[PDB]
Amino acid sequence: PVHILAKKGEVAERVLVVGDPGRARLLSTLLQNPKLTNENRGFLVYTGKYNGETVSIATHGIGGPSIAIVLEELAMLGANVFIRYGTTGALVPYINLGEYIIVTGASYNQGGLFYQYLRDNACVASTPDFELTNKLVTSFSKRNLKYYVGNVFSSDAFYAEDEEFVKKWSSRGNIAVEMECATLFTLSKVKGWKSATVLVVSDNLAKELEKSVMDGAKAVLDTLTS
Amino acid sequence: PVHILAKKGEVAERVLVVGDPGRARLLSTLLQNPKLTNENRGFLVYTGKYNGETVSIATHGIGGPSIAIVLEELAMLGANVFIRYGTTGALVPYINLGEYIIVTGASYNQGGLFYQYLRDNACVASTPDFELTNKLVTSFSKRNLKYYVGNVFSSDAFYAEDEEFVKKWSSRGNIAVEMECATLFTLSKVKGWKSATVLVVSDNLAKELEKSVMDGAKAVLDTLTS
Amino acid sequence: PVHILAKKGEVAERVLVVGDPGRARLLSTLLQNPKLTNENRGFLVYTGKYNGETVSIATHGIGGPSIAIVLEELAMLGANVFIRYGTTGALVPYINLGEYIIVTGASYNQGGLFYQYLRDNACVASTPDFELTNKLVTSFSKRNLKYYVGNVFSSDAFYAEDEEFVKKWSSRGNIAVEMECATLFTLSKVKGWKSATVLVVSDNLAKGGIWITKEELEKSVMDGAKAVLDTLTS
Amino acid sequence: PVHILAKKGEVAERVLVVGDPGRARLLSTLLQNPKLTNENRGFLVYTGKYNGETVSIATHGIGGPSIAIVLEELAMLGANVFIRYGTTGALVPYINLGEYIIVTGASYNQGGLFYQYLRDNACVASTPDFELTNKLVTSFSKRNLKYYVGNVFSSDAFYAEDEEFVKKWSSRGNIAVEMECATLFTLSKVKGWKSATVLVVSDNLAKELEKSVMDGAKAVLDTLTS
Amino acid sequence: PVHILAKKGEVAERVLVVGDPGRARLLSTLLQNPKLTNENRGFLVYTGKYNGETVSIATHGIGGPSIAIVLEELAMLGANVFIRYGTTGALVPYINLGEYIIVTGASYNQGGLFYQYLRDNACVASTPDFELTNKLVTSFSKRNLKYYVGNVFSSDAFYAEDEEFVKKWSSRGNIAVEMECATLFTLSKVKGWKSATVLVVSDNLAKELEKSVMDGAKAVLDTLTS
Amino acid sequence: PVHILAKKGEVAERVLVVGDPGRARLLSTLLQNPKLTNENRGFLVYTGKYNGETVSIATHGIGGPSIAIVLEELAMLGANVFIRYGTTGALVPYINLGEYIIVTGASYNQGGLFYQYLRDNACVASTPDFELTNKLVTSFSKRNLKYYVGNVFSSDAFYAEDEEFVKKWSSRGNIAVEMECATLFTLSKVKGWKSATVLVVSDNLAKITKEELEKSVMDGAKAVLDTLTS
Numbered sequence A, B, D, E: 001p002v003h004i005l006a007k008k009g010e011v012a013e014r015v016l017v018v019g020d021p022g023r024a025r026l027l028s029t030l031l032q033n034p035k036l037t038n039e040n041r042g043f044l045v046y047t048g049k050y051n052g053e054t055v056s057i058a059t060h061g062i063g064g065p066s067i068a069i070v071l072e073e074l075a076m077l078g079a080n081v082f083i084r085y086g087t088t089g090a091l092v093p094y095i096n097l098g099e100y101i102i103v104t105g106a107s108y109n110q111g112g113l114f115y116q117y118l119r120d121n122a123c124v125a126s127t128p129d130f131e132l133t134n135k136l137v138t139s140f141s142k143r144n145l146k147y148y149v150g151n152v153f154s155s156d157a158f159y160a161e162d163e164e165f166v167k168k169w170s171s172r173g174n175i176a177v178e179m180e181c182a183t184l185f186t187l188s189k190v191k192g193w194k195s196a197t198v199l200v201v202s203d204n205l206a207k208e209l210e211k212s213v214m215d216g217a218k219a220v221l222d223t224l225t226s
Numbered sequence C: 001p002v003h004i005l006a007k008k009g010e011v012a013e014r015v016l017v018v019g020d021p022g023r024a025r026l027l028s029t030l031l032q033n034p035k036l037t038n039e040n041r042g043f044l045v046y047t048g049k050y051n052g053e054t055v056s057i058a059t060h061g062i063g064g065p066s067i068a069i070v071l072e073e074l075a076m077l078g079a080n081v082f083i084r085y086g087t088t089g090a091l092v093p094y095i096n097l098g099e100y101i102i103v104t105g106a107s108y109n110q111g112g113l114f115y116q117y118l119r120d121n122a123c124v125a126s127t128p129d130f131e132l133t134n135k136l137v138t139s140f141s142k143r144n145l146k147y148y149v150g151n152v153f154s155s156d157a158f159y160a161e162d163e164e165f166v167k168k169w170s171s172r173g174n175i176a177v178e179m180e181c182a183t184l185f186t187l188s189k190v191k192g193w194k195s196a197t198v199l200v201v202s203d204n205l206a207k208g209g210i211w212i213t214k215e216e217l218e219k220s221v222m223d224g225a226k227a228v229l230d231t232l233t234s
Numbered sequence F: 001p002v003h004i005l006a007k008k009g010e011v012a013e014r015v016l017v018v019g020d021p022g023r024a025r026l027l028s029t030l031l032q033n034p035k036l037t038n039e040n041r042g043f044l045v046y047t048g049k050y051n052g053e054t055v056s057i058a059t060h061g062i063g064g065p066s067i068a069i070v071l072e073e074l075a076m077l078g079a080n081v082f083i084r085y086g087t088t089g090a091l092v093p094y095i096n097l098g099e100y101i102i103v104t105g106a107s108y109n110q111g112g113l114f115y116q117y118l119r120d121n122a123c124v125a126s127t128p129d130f131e132l133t134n135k136l137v138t139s140f141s142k143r144n145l146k147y148y149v150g151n152v153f154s155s156d157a158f159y160a161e162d163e164e165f166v167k168k169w170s171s172r173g174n175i176a177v178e179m180e181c182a183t184l185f186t187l188s189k190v191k192g193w194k195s196a197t198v199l200v201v202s203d204n205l206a207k208i209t210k211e212e213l214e215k216s217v218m219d220g221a222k223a224v225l226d227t228l229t230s
Helices: A021-028 A064-076 A112-118 A130-142 A165-170 A181-191 A209-224 B021-030 B064-076 B112-118 B130-142 B165-170 B181-191 B209-224 C021-030 C064-076 C112-118 C130-142 C165-171 C181-191 C214-232 D021-030 D064-076 D112-118 D130-142 D165-170 D181-191 D209-224 E021-030 E064-076 E112-118 E130-142 E165-170 E181-191 E209-224 F021-030 F064-076 F112-118 F130-142 F165-170 F181-191 F210-228
Strands: A014-018 A032-038 A045-050 A053-059 A081-090 A100-107 A147-154 A174-178 A194-204 B014-018 B032-038 B045-050 B053-059 B081-090 B100-107 B147-154 B174-178 B194-204 C014-018 C032-038 C045-050 C053-059 C081-090 C100-107 C147-154 C174-178 C194-204 D014-018 D032-038 D045-050 D053-059 D081-090 D100-107 D147-154 D174-178 D194-204 E014-018 E032-038 E045-050 E053-059 E081-090 E100-107 E147-154 E174-178 E194-204 F014-018 F032-038 F045-050 F053-059 F081-090 F100-107 F147-154 F174-178 F194-204
Touching: A014 A021, A014 A064, A014 A209, A021 A045, A021 A053, A021 A209, A053 A064, A053 A209, A064 A081, A064 A112, A064 A181, A064 F064, A081 A130, A081 A181, A081 A209, A100 A130, A100 A174, A100 A181, A112 A181, A130 A147, A130 A194, A130 A209, A147 A181, A165 A174, A174 A194, A181 A194, A194 A209, B014 B021, B014 B064, B014 B209, B021 B032, B021 B045, B021 B053, B021 B209, B053 B064, B053 B209, B064 B081, B064 B112, B064 B181, B064 C064, B081 B130, B081 B181, B081 B209, B100 B130, B100 B174, B100 B181, B112 B181, B112 C112, B130 B147, B130 B194, B130 B209, B147 B181, B165 B174, B174 B194, B181 B194, B194 B209, C014 C021, C014 C064, C014 C214, C021 C045, C021 C053, C021 C214, C053 C064, C053 C214, C064 C081, C064 C112, C064 C181, C081 C130, C081 C181, C081 C214, C100 C130, C100 C174, C100 C181, C112 C181, C130 C147, C130 C194, C130 C214, C130 D147, C147 C181, C147 D130, C165 C174, C174 C194, C181 C194, C194 C214, D014 D021, D014 D064, D014 D209, D021 D032, D021 D045, D021 D053, D021 D209, D032 D053, D053 D064, D053 D209, D064 D081, D064 D112, D064 D181, D064 E064, D081 D130, D081 D181, D081 D209, D100 D130, D100 D174, D100 D181, D112 D181, D130 D147, D130 D194, D130 D209, D147 D181, D165 D174, D174 D194, D181 D194, D194 D209, E014 E021, E014 E064, E014 E209, E021 E032, E021 E045, E021 E053, E021 E209, E053 E064, E053 E209, E064 E081, E064 E112, E064 E181, E081 E130, E081 E181, E081 E209, E100 E130, E100 E174, E100 E181, E112 E181, E130 E147, E130 E194, E130 E209, E130 F147, E147 E181, E147 F130, E165 E174, E174 E194, E181 E194, E194 E209, F014 F021, F014 F064, F014 F210, F021 F045, F021 F053, F021 F210, F053 F064, F053 F210, F064 F081, F064 F112, F064 F181, F081 F130, F081 F181, F081 F210, F100 F130, F100 F174, F100 F181, F112 F181, F130 F147, F130 F194, F130 F210, F147 F181, F165 F174, F174 F194, F181 F194, F194 F210
Parallel strands: A014 A053, A014 A081, A081 A194, A100 A147, A147 A174, B014 B053, B014 B081, B081 B194, B100 B147, B147 B174, C014 C053, C014 C081, C081 C194, C100 C147, C147 C174, D014 D053, D014 D081, D081 D194, D100 D147, D147 D174, E014 E053, E014 E081, E081 E194, E100 E147, E147 E174, F014 F053, F014 F081, F081 F194, F100 F147, F147 F174
Antiparallel strands: A032 A045, A045 A053, A081 A174, A100 A194, B032 B045, B045 B053, B081 B174, B100 B194, C032 C045, C045 C053, C081 C174, C100 C194, D032 D045, D045 D053, D081 D174, D100 D194, E032 E045, E045 E053, E081 E174, E100 E194, F032 F045, F045 F053, F081 F174, F100 F194
């Protein structure tokens, strides 16, 4: 690995990945005896214990290209189970800020990354691991957390304009928008990794926060270690 | 409707759809007091009772264009819950003939039908209803049936040659190939219908039958009426 | 074949193909000693004699994927000449219900079935056999039937909305719309089969108005069937 | 028009178009009292009479962009019937040099020109006028000329390398290759012009001349004035 | 070569290419002892001396397909440096008729020609030779000519309708429109030729000539022989 | 801005952008009175003076989606001149490690980000500002640094396999590969910003120590900063 300079053996098979380095540091406090295993290029990675299992929390930056590089390098270090925990904007009015979305699939526009990996324009099913996703639903349910299950649109251009944005993607079966799920799901299917994703709603395009992230993170860690 | 000319009220909200008219007739024997509600253009549709609920078994023919027409017309008659029960060829060696595959998503090539409905080439997540699919897993498990959960490639050209067929699609996360799931899933997401699919493995491209079909049909009917 | 289950030699070299199995059965009465050679999966196929020549009438269902399978399997059984006889919706106001359209080419949207067969997105000319198509024109004019010659758009989504549907496809040189011609023509060019198509106008998308009656449609379908069969046995 | 400087009334409704200015000048001798009505930018255009009808012979240069400009400007000047008479390379063994090909359709790669005119990538049927093409067949048969009827591939890159060229295009139903038919046919369909094409085989990629060109020109002029 | 019948030794390594045969003949008068080395198919090519160097002035017609053929054939005869001198329509208000545009890149719609040469739909950077373009700036500055530096859109359909044309392309960084630069630049990069382009503004889509063409030609010839 | 949280006026009009936050910090030492104007989400941004001129040094992370967000937010904060200074893999054998490439254009695969911004699949010319790029050449030659001028392929998948990678992109006129060029150039043309790029060769795919690289990075940074404040 040329970006993640973590020593081989310092990265767990089970990894919680987040886009924000700051959330990685904050969530590391939920682990027993956390150690910083990488800080190169700002990609903070911490490894520790939780519920009798070794687990790592890694930063993936923003966007498909960035998360692809991080997943690939983490895997070269032994990682094979990934659960992304990020933030998202809801596309439907009934979902409230601070609530969660357990992702079942990701819509995306065909682009360079998918073409470079798949070698043509086929729309490969971009879905998470079935079992792992059901475990997430069980974990969030046990902790009495308000969640919704559905697909999301993984955008590559946060600031591009689209006057019909909400209607278009919500009418296509998506309940939220973010930027990395499609890449995570598809690359995982291709490489053979088990992945899933849970998102914290930080905005509603159709219409506390710190505690929201912390509570859901515990649910995710229970799933990763169960 | 111009293809399915059944009287409104003669089609249930819950519908089991199969590609073969002969399987529709055979499975109708599992219903209480079944009545043939449509015969036009060979699209046999039967309506009856099962476990205290009215249910219909409909023929959708072969291919995305055909199933799209049938789903649209059945919906115009009141149907909104669809479970396809078809046949498929496995893409991995460990799956045996007669066993089942509960579909979690469908890969497909960019095509006219999707372009016509979506209005551009976006790869919309083609996935089944999360809840309905889990009920299917529960039903098949209760009847002690051997099944596998995973994505499938929905082909539009049964006889097109591809020297790397099995390798390409199995490496893209697909465990079987059929021809209607992508259309069923995507159109359902767009229209707001709840759909799912279970397939009977009738061939293995990488490596009793009547009994298998009948057995699985019972699990599907239990799911539909749960 | 795994969909069309017919015995050895039960399928003729020349086939009249229709989408509706009910039409296959009805037209089978125009033949001598018609025999049901296949009924599996609802794809009714009949083989009999017309003007002393052996021919078959086969059901292809709806859509490119369905007709592709049927054509391939029929070819495996000995067929190499196909004339599709279906129904269509006109895209221009001057064509009336019950009249006919002899197809000269098919417009289509790229992807799926074509990408799998062609191996890339080239727009291969989707045209019928020149000679056979001219024979159809001769046959229809001989029976004093009203027909128009032109291209059609082969749609994959019957119910997909498009607010500019008629002006779009009619401005692109198409006079009607159906769902199987592009697949029939392109697959035939690649597989080495001779194909053609005649359609009965059962709706006009360019102007509102009366619906065609059952008797009217059947009479139109029957009169046209004779012209097609004459061509297939010519 | 800014390329073809001919005045209105100087261009006939019936036009025989050729790519080579030299062929236009050579064929003008078949007309009665031919007059040069344009020479700007090398696009020679002659107008005269043949068989009781006024006809023009116009140069269109090489390629889709060039012929599109010429056709558009000739039409603005009154032209509405066009028959291209060009040279081609056969893609099948049996066709001999000096023989003719009456074009029934044109295959092409989706490109800028088609996208700019059609507004999307639909594969619009690129075919000549049915009636006009049959008249050509009749005219060539009447003059006992050896011809073949079939589709051609309209290439945009004469010198682009493709090791599977002959097999690829011939297996796709094309018997020859040239560069302007697809543009002529599609644009004519959109604009409502009646067009056709006859080609002189000057090379064979799978396996006297001046006379061949002259003989076919007479047959084309007969068709144009029928 | 089958279009440009010039003999080896008759074409210089340095070539000034123009679309109009009439401009080629007009500009040949700027050369010392000009000789016509080809007129086949209207593609006039002249060869003479300028500033102690041998140079050729060649006609390329209109459009990507046509210029591709000419460039490939001139190269087969020894040419390796090409400077296109053409006409263009300004896409911004401030540029006046008769002024010049030194091209820094070309935008284009993916099309047949590019697909045939590149083998896929990648957007390969279509730029001129850096060193040569800078020499052009120097030559025009030295002769006190008013010029602008920027990208142009290379259209394939001069007459295709587009109600948002000026706004669309000018907002994409293009200050003018013409039809051959994209082909010239991309083919040159692939073949290893050194190319550049200067255009004379003959129209402005957002808002003496002989003198402008002549003055600019002298500056181009200075560049070619420096 | 929701990613780059800088106080009003803390971002200069001219910005040197780098992908590695560690490089941003390292180069901030070349400025006068450098101040950390942002650290949110790891996108370190510093503002200070060079040759008496105010400038900023900002981190853009890796990939088109990331640099697009960063450029948009810096522009909202007042920036309109961007020079990317990154690392790259050469695609031709004659370019050596530690040398520099001044970018004249960017090749890329269509889709995603470009489709969303351009609204269709047109291959819009992805080029840097002409004048700014020439100033870079002048600055590097003035400091006697070894550089090459040419196009680069902006890849979206660093680890995607391609058996003909080097031959394919080098035969298409590209002399190096990186990941943010196309997005920077194209977005800049559409948004009306002046941009350019210089890359440090850290690998050669057709065929460097920590000190060799850092020294090369440092020497080139001076030339870029000279251009930005010229």
